[PDB]
Symmetry: T
Subunit: 161 residues, 12 copies
C-alpha cells in the first residue's frame, strides 16, 4: 500500500502519520455526509438560515478531506475514503434518519461535530510529537474550521431566545 518517495520524513513517521491521516479522513468524510443529511431533512422555524449554514460547513469539510487524504498519499501511503472504509473506520454514532425538527438536528450535529473537532485537535499534537509539522499544520487548519463550525452550532442552543 506504499510507494517510494524522495520525501525524507522518517519511515516510522510516515507509517504513523498515514494511519493518523486515514483515521481523520474517515471521520471527516462521515461528517461531510452527516452534514448534508441534516441539510436536506431539517424542518422548523430556523430552516433557511441553518440549511444554508450547513452548506458552508460541507464546503469547508470538503477542502479538509482533500488536504488530509492527499497528505497521506504525499508521504507514500494510500488514502482510504470509500463508503466501505468510512462505515468501518469512523467512530461517529450513526446519524438518525428519522429526525426533522431543527433543534433535533442541531443537538445531533453538535455531538458529531464535537467528536470530530476533538479528534482533529488532538491529531495536531500527535503529528507534532511524531515530527511531522506539515501534517500538524493541516490538522490545525482543519481544527480551526471544526471549532468554528462547532461554535456556530452550539451558539444556536446556548441560550433559548
Amino acid at each position: 500500500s506504499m510507494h517510494a518517495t524522495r520525501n525524507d520524513l522518517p519511515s516510522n513517521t510516515k507509517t504513523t502519520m498515514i494511519a493518523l491521516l486515514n483515521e481523520n479522513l474517515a471521520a471527516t468524510i462521515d461528517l461531510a455526509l452527516i452534514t448534508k443529511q441534516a441539510h436536506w431533512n431539517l424542518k422548523g422555524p430556523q430552516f433557511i438560515a441553518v440549511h444554508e449554514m450547513l452548506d458552508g460547513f460541507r464546503a469547508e469539510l470538503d477542502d479538509h478531506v482533500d488536504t488530509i487524504a492527499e497528505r497521506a498519499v504525499q508521504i507514500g501511503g494510500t488514502a482510504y475514503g470509500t463508503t466501505q472504509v468510512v462505515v468501518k473506520e469512523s467512530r461517529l454514532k450513526p446519524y438518525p434518519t428519522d429526525i426533522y425538527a431543527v433543534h433535533d438536528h442541531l443537538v445531533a450535529l453538535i455531538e458529531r461535530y464535537g467528536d470530530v473537532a476533538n479528534l482533529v485537535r488532538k491529531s495536531i499534537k500527535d503529528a507534532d510529537d511524531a515530527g511531522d509539522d506539515d501534517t500538524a499544520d493541516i490538522f490545525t487548519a482543519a481544527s480551526r474550521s471544526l471549532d468554528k463550525a462547532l461554535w456556530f452550532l452550539e451558539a444556536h442552543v446556548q441560550e433559548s431566545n
Copy 2:
C-alpha cells in the same frame, strides 16, 4: 418519514418517486466517494490530467446528489444519504483500495460510472411513466452529465495510442 405538502403530485406517485430518488441518491453519493478515492490514489504517466478531470466529475455529481435528495424532500419524503444507508443501498461494487495505475482506475471507474449512468437513464423513463415530469427532468440532467463523464473515461481506453 413523510411530511405534508401542498404539492399535488398524486399520493401514490410521491411514494414511488421518493423510493426511486433515494435509490439513485445512494448510487450517486457512492459514485462521488469513489471518484475522489481514485483522484487521490492514481499513479502513472497520465496522472495530472486524469487527477484534475476527476475533480470536475465530483463537482458535477455533488450538484446532482443535492438535486435528487431535495426532490425527494420536496414531494414530502426523507432523503437518505448517510454512510450507513449508502453502504446498504448502493449496488455499486466496493471500489478496490489497492489499485494505483491510472489504467486500473480508469477500468474500475468505467464500470461504476457505467452502472450509475444506466441506472439514472432508466430512472428518467420510470419517472416519466409514473407521471413525475420534474423528477424525470432531474434524472435527465444527471444522465447527461453521467453519459458525458462515462465518455471522458472510455475515450481514454477506446484506442491504445
Copy 3:
C-alpha cells in the same frame, strides 16, 4: 393579436399554448408581486433569513416570467402582463396587506406558491400532450423552481422547533 412566424408548430397547438402561457404568465407575475409584498412587511424573530430568502424567490420568478412571456411571443402570440390583465387572469387569492408576523406570511405564501406550483406542473403535461416540447420544458424549469421554493416555505412550518 397574432403575427406570422416560420415556426411550424401547428396553428391549433400555437393557439392553445399561447393561452396556456398567458395563464401561467399572469399567475407568476402576481406571485412575484406577492413575494415582494411579504418581503417588505414581514416582522418577527425570523425576519432577516426569510426577508432575504424571498428576494431569491423573486429573482427566480422574474426569469421564468420572461421565459414564459417570450415563448408566447415566439410562437406568434401576444404576452399579456399589465396590472389590468394580471388582476383578472391571475387565479391567486388576493394577498392580505394587513399581516406582519412571519408565521402569517409563511402560511399565506405557502397557499399562493402551492397554487402556482401545481398550475405550472400540470401545464407541463398540457404542453407535452399538445406536442409542444419546448413549452413543456419551459414549464418544467419553472416547476422545478416553484416546487423547491414551496419546499423552502413549507419546511419552515412542517415542524415547530
Copy 4:
C-alpha cells in the same frame, strides 16, 4: 397598519410620508410591469436595441420600487404593492395590449414614463417640505433614473432620422 419605531420623525411626518411613498410605489410598480409588457411585444426595425434598453429600465425601476417600499416600512408603515392595490392606486392610463410597432410603444411609454417622472420629481419637494430628507433623497435618486429613461425614450422620437 403601523408598528412603532425609534425613528424620531414626528407622527404627522411619518403618516404623510408613508402615504406619499405608497402613492409613488403604486406608480413605479405599474410602470415596471408596463416596461416588460412593451419589451416582450415590440416589433419593427429597432427591435433588439429597444428590447434590451427596456430591460435596463426595468432593472433600475426594481431597485427604486424596493427602496420606496422599504422606506415606508422603516418609518413605521405598511408597503402596499399587490396587484389589487396597484390597479386601484396607480393613475397611469392602462397600457394597451394591442400595439406592436416600436414607434407605438415608444409613444405610449413616453406618456407613462413622463407621468411617473413628474410625480416622483414633485414628491422630492413634498418630502423636503415635510422635513423628511431621507425620503426626499430616495425620490431624488428615483427621479434621476426616471428623467434619464424618459430622455432615452424621447430621444428616439425627437428627430426622425
Copy 5:
C-alpha cells in the same frame, strides 16, 4: 465508425440517434457559419445592434454544436463536422455572399433559422420516439435557443416602424 461503450441504449437506437445527431450537427455548423457571414457584411441604419445580436446567436449555436456532436460520440458514434461533410449534409440553401442591407440579411437569415429551428424541433420527437431521452433533451435546449433566435430576427420585420 463505432466504438464500444457501457452506455446501454439499444444498438438500433444508437445507430439511428447517431444519424439524427449528425444530420442536426451539419445543419447547425452550417447555420453558425451563415450567422458570421451576415454579421461581417451587414450594412444599413440598424447595423450595430443587429451586428452584435448575431454574435450572441453564434455563441449559442457553438454550444449546441458541441453538445450535439459529443452526444453522437458518447453513444458510441463518430461526429462528422468537417467542411466537406457539412457542405454535403446541410440542406440549407447556400447563403448569398452579395447582400448587405440589414433587411436582406434578416430575410435570408429567417429562411435558414426557420429551417434549422423546424428540423431541431422535429428531432426532439424523433429522439423521444426512439427512447433516447438525453438526446431529446439536447435537441430541446437547442430548439429553445433556435426558436428564440428566430423570433429576434422575425420581430425586426413583423412590423415596419
Copy 6:
C-alpha cells in the same frame, strides 16, 4: 488643528461642520465597535442569520465613518477617531458585555442604532442650515443606511412570531 484649503466654504461653516462631523464620527465609530461586540457574543435560535446581518451593518458603518472623517479633513479640520476621543465624545450608553440572548442584543442594538440614526438625521438639517450641502448629503447617505439597519433590527421584535 486646521490646515489651509482653497475650498471656499465660509470659514464659520468649516468650523461648525468640522465639529458636527466629529460628533457624528465619534457616535458612528462607537456604533461600529458595538455592532461587532454583539456579532461575536450572541447566542440563540436566530444565531447565524443575525450574526451575518450584523457584519453587513458593520461594513456599511465603516464606509460612513470614513466618509464623515474625510469630510472633516477636506474642509480643513482634524478627524478625531482614537479610542480616547471616542470614549469621551460618544454619547452612546456603554454596551453590556454580559448579555448573550439574541433578543437581548437586538434590543440593546435598537437602543444605540436608534440614538445614532436620530443624531445623523438631525445633522443633515444642521449641515443644510449651515450651507454645507456636501456634508448634508454625506449625512443623508449615512442616515438612509442607519434607518434601514434600525428597521432590520426592529422588524425582529415588532412581532413575536
Copy 7:
C-alpha cells in the same frame, strides 16, 4: 438648440439649468484634460504614486462630465463639449505645458481643482434655488468628488515632511 420633453420642470428653470450645466461641463472637461496633462509629464521623487492618483481623478471626472452633459440634454437642451467650446467657455487658467516637477504640478492642479470644486459647490445651491433638485444632486455628487480630490492634492503640500 432645444427639443420637446414631457419633463415638467418649469421652462425658465430648464433654460437657466441648461446654461449652468454647460458652464460646469466646460470647466470639468477642461479639468479632465489638465489632469492627464499633469499625469503624463510629472517628474520627481513622488512620481508613481501621484501619476496613479491622477488617473483615479480622471476616471471620476469622466463620470461627472457625462452626468452633467446628459442632464442638460434630459431637460431639453444641448450639451456643449467640443474643444472649441471648452477653450472659450472654461473659466480655468490655461494649464502650463512647461512644468515637470511634481511639486509644480501639485500647485498648478490645486489652483484648477480649487476653481472647479468651488464652482460646482456653488452650483448645487444655484440649482436648489431654481427648484431643480436632480440637478442640485448631480452637482452634489460631483462636488463631493472634487472636494475629496482637492484634499488629496493639498494634503501633499500642507506639510513638508
Copy 8:
C-alpha cells in the same frame, strides 16, 4: 521640453517622433471630445444603439491617447494635451454643435474618424521609416482601432435598408 533618458533611440529620431506623437495626440484627444459631443446630442430612431456604440469608441480612443502621450514622454519629450494645445494643433474641422439627427452625426463623425484614421495609418510608416519600431507599433494598434471604428460608422450609411 526635453529630459535625459538612457533610451538609445537616436537623438534625431527622438525629436522627430516626439513631434509626430504630439500631432497624433492632438488629433485623437480632439476626436475623443467629438465622440462624446455626438453621444450626448444624437436623436432619432437609432438613438440607443449608436449612443452606446460611441461610448465604446471613446473608451478605445482614451487608451490610445494615453499610449501615444506616454511614448513621447518615454523617449525624452513633453506630451501636449491641454485644450489650448489641442484646439491649435488638431486639424479636425470643428464639430457642429447644432446637429441632432443620428444620420447627421454619423456623417460628421465619418469625416473626422476618416481624417484621424488616415493620419495615424500614415504615421505608422513615418515612424517605421525613422527607425522607431515601438512608436510604429503604437500607431498600428491605434490605427487598427480607428479603422474598425470608421467601419462601424460607415456600415450604418453604406446601405439604407
Copy 9:
C-alpha cells in the same frame, strides 16, 4: 462586392489585401472546423488533455477569423466565410473522418496547422509589401497563435516518452 470608405489605403492595395484576407479566412475557418472534428473524435491515453487543448486552439482561431474577416470589410470589401466558399478556397487536405487514436489526430492536425501557419506567416510579408501595415499586424497576431499551437502539437510527437 465593394462599398465606399474614407480609409485611404490605395485602391490597388485594397483589392489585393481583400483577396489576401479572404484566402486566409478560408484557411482559418477550415482549420477551426478541423480542430473541433479532432476534439470530438479523439480517443486514447492522452484524451482529456489533448481534448481540452484543442478547445483553446479553437477559441484563438475564432478570434483571428473575426479579425481577418472584419479587416476585409473595413477596407471596403466582402468577407467570404460560408461553407460553399471555404470548401472551394481552402487548400487544406480534407480531414479524415475515420481516425480516432490521439496519435493519428496529432499527426493529421500538425499537417494542417503547419500549412495554415506557413500561409499566414507569408501573408504578413505580402501585406507589408503592399503597404498595409494593419493587415500585416493582423496576420502577425494570427501567426504567433498558429506557431504556438503548432509547437503544442509537435511537442507531443518530437519525443516518444
Copy 10:
C-alpha cells in the same frame, strides 16, 4: 461569562486562552482605530501612497480582530471589544491627535505597531505553552501580518533617501 461547549480543550486552557485572546483583542482593536486616525490626518509629500497603505493595514487588522474575538467565544468565553474595554485594556500610548506630517505619523505608528507586533508574537508561545494549537496558529497569522506591516512602516524611515 462562560458557556458550555463540547470543545474538549482543558478547562484551565480555556480560561487562560480566553484572557490572552481578550488582551490581544484590545490591543488590535485600538491599533485598528489608530491606523485610521493616521490615515485621515496625514499630510506631506508621500500622502497618497501612505494613506492607501494604511487602509491595507486596517483591512488585515479587521480580519485578525474577528478571528481573535471569535476564538475566545468558540472555546466558551466572552469577547470584550467595546470602546470602554479597549480604552482600559489596551496598553498602547494614546495616539496624538495633533500631528500631521507623514514622518511624525510614521514614527508614532511604528511605536504602536511595534508594541502590538511584539505582544502578538509572544502570545503565540503563551498559547503553545497552554496546549492551544489553534489559538497559537491564530496568533501566528496575526503576527505575520503585524511583522510585515511593521516592516512596511519602518522601511519608510530606515533610510533617508
Copy 11:
C-alpha cells in the same frame, strides 16, 4: 547589512534566521528557474498536461520566494536573490539543458524538488528550535506546497501505466 527594527525577536534568533531564510531563498529561486526550464523544453506524449502543471508549481514557488525574502527583511536583515548569489548558495545540481523527453524532465525535477522539499521541511524545525514561530510557519506553508508538488511529480513515475 542589518537595519534597526522594533521587532523584539532576540538578536541571535534574528541572525540565525536571516541566514536560514537566505539559504532557503537561494534554493527556492533556483528551483523556480529550473521549473520554467523544464516547462519550456519538455517534449513527448504528456506534453500539455505537464507543461501546464509546471506553471502551477512556478506560481506557488514565486509566492513562497517572496514570503521567505520579506521575512528576512522584516527581522532586520537583507534578502539575497540575485543570479550571482543564487548560483553560489543553491546546492541544487545544475539542471541539464540537453534533455527533452517528459520522462527525463520528471526524473530530473524529482531530484531537485526532493532536495528543496527536504531542506524546507527541516528548516521548519530549525526555526521552531530558534524560537521564531512566524518563520517556522512560513517554511511550513512552503513545505506543504513543495511536498504536494513532489507528489504530483512522483505520481507520474510511481506506476508505469
Copy 12:
C-alpha cells in the same frame, strides 16, 4: 539542441533567432531577479509606491520571459534559462546587494533596465532583418514594456521635487 518542425522559417533564420532569443532571455531573467532584489530591500520615504511599482515590472517581465523562451522552442530550438546559463550569458553588471536607499535602487535599476531596453529594441531590428516577423513582434511588445518601465524609473530622478 534542435527538434524538427513544420515551421518554415529558413534554416539560418531559425539558428540566428534562437541565439538572439536566448541572448534576450538571459538578460530578461536576470532583470526579473534584479527587480525582486530591489523590491525586497528598498528603504526610504518613497518605499511603498516604489515597492509596489517593482512588482508590476516583475509581472510584465515574467510574461515577456515566457514569450521569448517559447518562441525559441517553437522555431525548433532550446530555451536556456537556468541560473548557470543566465549568470554566464547575461551582460548586466552584477546587482549590488549592499544598497537600500530608494535612490540607490533607482539608479542601479535605471542602469540595468536601460541596458535591457536597448538590447531588446535593437533585437526587433535584428529579427526584422532576418525575416522573422513574429520574433520581431515579440521583441516589440517586450521593448514597449521595457521603455515604459525605464521611464517610470527615470521619471523619479529627472526632477528633484
